[PDB]
Amino acid sequence: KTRKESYAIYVYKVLKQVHPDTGISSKAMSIMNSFVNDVFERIAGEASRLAHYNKRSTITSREIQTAVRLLLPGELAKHAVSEGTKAVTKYTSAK
Amino acid sequence: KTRKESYAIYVYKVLKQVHPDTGISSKAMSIMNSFVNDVFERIAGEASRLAHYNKRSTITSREIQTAVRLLLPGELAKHAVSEGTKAVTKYTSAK
Amino acid sequence: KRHRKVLRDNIQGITKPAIRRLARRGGVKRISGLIYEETRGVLKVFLENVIRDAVTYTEHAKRKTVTAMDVVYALKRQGRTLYGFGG
Amino acid sequence: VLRDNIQGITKPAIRRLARRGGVKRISGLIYEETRGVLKVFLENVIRDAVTYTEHAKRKTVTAMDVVYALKRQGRTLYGFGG
Amino acid sequence: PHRYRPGTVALREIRRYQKSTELLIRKLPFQRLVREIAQDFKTDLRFQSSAVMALQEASEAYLVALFEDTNLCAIHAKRVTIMPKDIQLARRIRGE
Amino acid sequence: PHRYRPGTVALREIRRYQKSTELLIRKLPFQRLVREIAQDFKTDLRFQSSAVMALQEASEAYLVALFEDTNLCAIHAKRVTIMPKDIQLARRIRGE
Amino acid sequence: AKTRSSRAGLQFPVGRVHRLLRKGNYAERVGAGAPVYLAAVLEYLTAEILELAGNAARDNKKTRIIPRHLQLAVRNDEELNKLLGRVTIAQGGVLPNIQSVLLPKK
Amino acid sequence: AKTRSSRAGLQFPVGRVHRLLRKGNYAERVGAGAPVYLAAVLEYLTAEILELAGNAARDNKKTRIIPRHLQLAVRNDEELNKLLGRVTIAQGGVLPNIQSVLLPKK
DNA sequence: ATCAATATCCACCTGCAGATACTACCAAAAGTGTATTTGGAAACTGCTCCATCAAAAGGCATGTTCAGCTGATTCAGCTGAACATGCCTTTTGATGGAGCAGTTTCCAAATACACTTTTGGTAGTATCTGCAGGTGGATATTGAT
DNA sequence: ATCAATATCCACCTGCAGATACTACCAAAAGTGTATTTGGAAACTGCTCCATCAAAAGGCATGTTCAGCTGAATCAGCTGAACATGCCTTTTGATGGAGCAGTTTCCAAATACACTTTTGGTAGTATCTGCAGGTGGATATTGAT
Ligand SMILES: [Mg+2]
Numbered sequence A, B: 001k002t003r004k005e006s007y008a009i010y011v012y013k014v015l016k017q018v019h020p021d022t023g024i025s026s027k028a029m030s031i032m033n034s035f036v037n038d039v040f041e042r043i044a045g046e047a048s049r050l051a052h053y054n055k056r057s058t059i060t061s062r063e064i065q066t067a068v069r070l071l072l073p074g075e076l077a078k079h080a081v082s083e084g085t086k087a088v089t090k091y092t093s094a095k
Numbered sequence C: 001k002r003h004r005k006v007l008r009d010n011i012q013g014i015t016k017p018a019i020r021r022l023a024r025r026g027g028v029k030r031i032s033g034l035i036y037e038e039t040r041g042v043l044k045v046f047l048e049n050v051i052r053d054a055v056t057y058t059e060h061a062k063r064k065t066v067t068a069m070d071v072v073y074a075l076k077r078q079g080r081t082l083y084g085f086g087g
Numbered sequence D: 001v002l003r004d005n006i007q008g009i010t011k012p013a014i015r016r017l018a019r020r021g022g023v024k025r026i027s028g029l030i031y032e033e034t035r036g037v038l039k040v041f042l043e044n045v046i047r048d049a050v051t052y053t054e055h056a057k058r059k060t061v062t063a064m065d066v067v068y069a070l071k072r073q074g075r076t077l078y079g080f081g082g
Numbered sequence E, F: 001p002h003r004y005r006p007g008t009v010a011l012r013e014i015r016r017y018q019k020s021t022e023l024l025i026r027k028l029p030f031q032r033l034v035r036e037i038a039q040d041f042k043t044d045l046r047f048q049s050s051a052v053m054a055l056q057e058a059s060e061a062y063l064v065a066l067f068e069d070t071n072l073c074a075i076h077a078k079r080v081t082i083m084p085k086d087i088q089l090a091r092r093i094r095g096e
Numbered sequence G, H: 001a002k003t004r005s006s007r008a009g010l011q012f013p014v015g016r017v018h019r020l021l022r023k024g025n026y027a028e029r030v031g032a033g034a035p036v037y038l039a040a041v042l043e044y045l046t047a048e049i050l051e052l053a054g055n056a057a058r059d060n061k062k063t064r065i066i067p068r069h070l071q072l073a074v075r076n077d078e079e080l081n082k083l084l085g086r087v088t089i090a091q092g093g094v095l096p097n098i099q100s101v102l103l104p105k106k
Numbered sequence I: 001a002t003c004a005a006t007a008t009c010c011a012c013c014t015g016c017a018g019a020t021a022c023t024a025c026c027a028a029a030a031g032t033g034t035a036t037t038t039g040g041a042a043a044c045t046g047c048t049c050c051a052t053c054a055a056a057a058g059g060c061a062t063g064t065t066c067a068g069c070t071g072a073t074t075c076a077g078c079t080g081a082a083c084a085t086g087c088c089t090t091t092t093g094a095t096g097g098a099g100c101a102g103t104t105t106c107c108a109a110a111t112a113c114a115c116t117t118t119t120g121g122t123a124g125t126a127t128c129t130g131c132a133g134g135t136g137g138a139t140a141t142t143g144a145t
Numbered sequence J: 001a002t003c004a005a006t007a008t009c010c011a012c013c014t015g016c017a018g019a020t021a022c023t024a025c026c027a028a029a030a031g032t033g034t035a036t037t038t039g040g041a042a043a044c045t046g047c048t049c050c051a052t053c054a055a056a057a058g059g060c061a062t063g064t065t066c067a068g069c070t071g072a073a074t075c076a077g078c079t080g081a082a083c084a085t086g087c088c089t090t091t092t093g094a095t096g097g098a099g100c101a102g103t104t105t106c107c108a109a110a111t112a113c114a115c116t117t118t119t120g121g122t123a124g125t126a127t128c129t130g131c132a133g134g135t136g137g138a139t140a141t142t143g144a145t
Helices: A009-018 A026-053 A060-070 A074-093 B008-018 B024-055 B061-071 B074-092 C016-025 C035-060 C068-075 D010-022 D032-053 D063-072 E008-019 E027-041 E049-076 E084-093 F008-019 F028-041 F049-074 F084-092 G004-009 G014-023 G034-059 G067-075 G078-083 H005-008 H015-024 H031-056 H066-077 H078-081
Strands: C082-083 D074-078 G087-091 H085-091
Touching: A009 A026, A009 G034, A026 A060, A026 C082, A026 D032, A026 D063, A026 G014, A026 G034, A026 G067, A060 A074, A060 D032, A074 C035, A074 G004, A074 G034, A074 G078, B008 B024, B008 B061, B024 B061, B024 D074, B024 H015, B024 H031, B024 H066, B061 B074, B061 C035, B061 D010, B061 G067, B061 H031, B074 H005, B074 H031, C016 C035, C016 E008, C016 E049, C035 C068, C035 E027, C035 E049, C035 E084, C035 G034, C068 C082, C068 E049, C082 E049, C082 F008, D010 D032, D010 F008, D010 F049, D032 E084, D032 F084, D063 D074, D063 F008, D063 F049, E008 G004, E027 E049, E027 H085, E049 F049, E049 F084, E084 F049, E084 F084, E084 H066, F028 F049, F049 F084, F049 G014, F049 H085, F084 G034, G004 G034, G004 H066, G034 G067, G034 G078, G067 G078, G078 H078, H005 H015, H005 H031, H015 H031, H015 H085, H031 H066, H066 H078
Parallel strands: C082 G087, D074 H085
Antiparallel strands: none
């Protein structure tokens, strides 16, 4: 009866943080789910190619970062970069 | 010093078979090589996606064939498929 | 089962009023009388292309049923990514 | 005779480009429009190439940096490697 | 017997359709069209209903955006009436 | 004392530049423009010679095809003279 | 026992993202920071779109974001519009928009 | 020791094609026939283009294929043109083509 | 019409950039042979959801009428095409040195693995609520006069 | 301007499907803690090929002049919008089974070293040739008359 994963509970968590009294319809959620898978594949793909172009067989935070600057337009890239740099910084210090 | 690979010799071998008295410029050969690399990447990428869509760990000739059908326009696909099926026949019926 | 009924000329189910509506949504004020057949023609080409690719995925998977994912992947290949159906 | 760089893309040269494109008559405002467009195109592609340059930690933009950036902008070029 | 002038109902419909999101082609007819086109590629095919709905959403969004482009080709010709030549110029420029 | 009609030389040039494949913008002014633009993203940059060439081939290919579409947009409006509005329409329909 | 998400200060699931990177065959190896950085980017972007869609719900006197809200949010924002420039949001409709020459009188 | 190419009847290198597939991260595994099929397809499309390009060289009094020929070969053929609809052949120029409304009155 | 200015053609000639051809050579693929592992087709079959069917909900087809848009016609003015007439930029080549690319080292970060804990999904039975659609009545827009 | 036909607004309400809420449950995910491998960073370095600049090459900037295009204004013919009318097809909602999807079995085919052979790439040289870019001379094209 196999299980279908989605980002729903995380999308939902994030929704409560920005708009604590707003719901999301299941159709709207299916879209948010498509959106995250989509940006996922697009970023991971750029990172894949990038690693290959540089004869590097490892995908690091450095590849994801460049992938983000190649994929996202100006301001979104800038903010995404921050959030990712700071998640890593924090991740590394937590051990 | 590092070996720079290319399909150049194979393109030349094919040139002589199809036009035995015609030569090719370096710049035209460079274009042919881009062409082969490009068609390679498009077919492989499409086969990759196919195998992922169907939760298989292996790219086979079957995936290469569906990739070809997805990618090439009508007649080109048809002749490519029959070229491909043929080469795999010869390959098998041969020790 | 017994003989599934013949399908012909369904292009004509895309009616003059339904096409006019789509043009409205698209911002269109006035519509020459030849637009309806032109649009039907353009739509058919659009569906042939998408369906061809969808059906190619179905057959590859050895199924008899065209799935939403078959269509979603055919849409992506075609540069017409669709969110909302398993994307 | 101090002159802008974009202006080095000259009337006669834009006019040739148009001719290759089958254009017969050209209005005086085209030259400035065209430069605007060329600038946008080079910004978009160069940005991406330079981002490849930086990633590899080079000071030199390579043909491959440009080719790879052309590819992702949907402008695949044949002739310069890859 | 009142009569709106030519144009007035047309603008009212633009406003109304631009504000809603429901599909505009009747469902069953669209589905028959899909089945007919599919059958000609391959017999004995079945369809998930969400596969048919996915095609409809895609086909309707493709066509709405094609009309916007078509509209801008007409307006460029100093008309307010879309014609086959507008659609064809849109499709040519789009590289279809 | 002899003058060609306006449009005769233009045609002669169309035939000539469609026959040939040489780049149509001088290399150096192009080189400077490239370098000027790249400076806003990274200071102290060198360019392989082939890098700059690749960029010129691509820009010229791009501008030539856009001039085709532009020309189609002028013709659509029943003109034979290309204008900024034709370029603008072409870019809008391409989705640029 | 800390999740890598808590460790990194994220709502989005870092184990999942690491696993999904492995199964996707993007590279022989996936670095430890990669899913952390990728998960943050993804979390960010969904926050950006939810902020905006949330506003469109509010602007339309509603409390439940539906796909029309997502579409209003995306198409009204220059950058999200570009990132999703080749994407269709089912049940989104279009922005209200009527070319000038089409309006009545003068 | 007979190469896989000669086994398959091919001028294009099967072993290389195989190595390029493994090291390409397309899938965990690569079946025995996939390189063979791929290499045939590639040989085939190459022959198809060199065919038409060569013809085009002939028609221009030339025995050496240059970019210009590859361009005329490709853009004069409906299917190759579509395959390469988003591709620029450096130094290819364009097809002679003048819109008829631009012709002088005769 | 003819006449003459200029462009365009074809044949033939040649010099050298660009292409073929050589060969020692040699590393790193590509093939081979043996040992081990696993992916996915087959056979069985649980169970979702698709095709298909009848009852009313409710848009479509057609003809009539005429408002106003398209497209032809005309025409004057301004705007690009052509083509003089000079200079100033670009191209070409030559020569230091920046940096990219090759190579070797070694350790931090990676994969592998086994075993222990947590989590996200689903199922089942639960009651909860946002808004769609209905109403009617208050105001706005539209078009005749 | 006014009047009056009809669309539009929004405010209030009841029904209900779609959302949210809950407990019991578990498989597979994720975390944790070892043992073992290695990708790529660092550091040093030899050699392209890049930026520079000076000498030779040559195209573009400018102004005058006017052909012929663009766009305005005017008009009629006729297309396409609006709307009344009649009525047929799609929408929706409830059962029977085709096929999809979840088991488990198991071998044909995959990967994984290790080991032997070859080929494709480079470098040094030398060797060769297709054709671009002149030339003369014949005719075609264009534009004046
Ligand atoms: Mg049929």
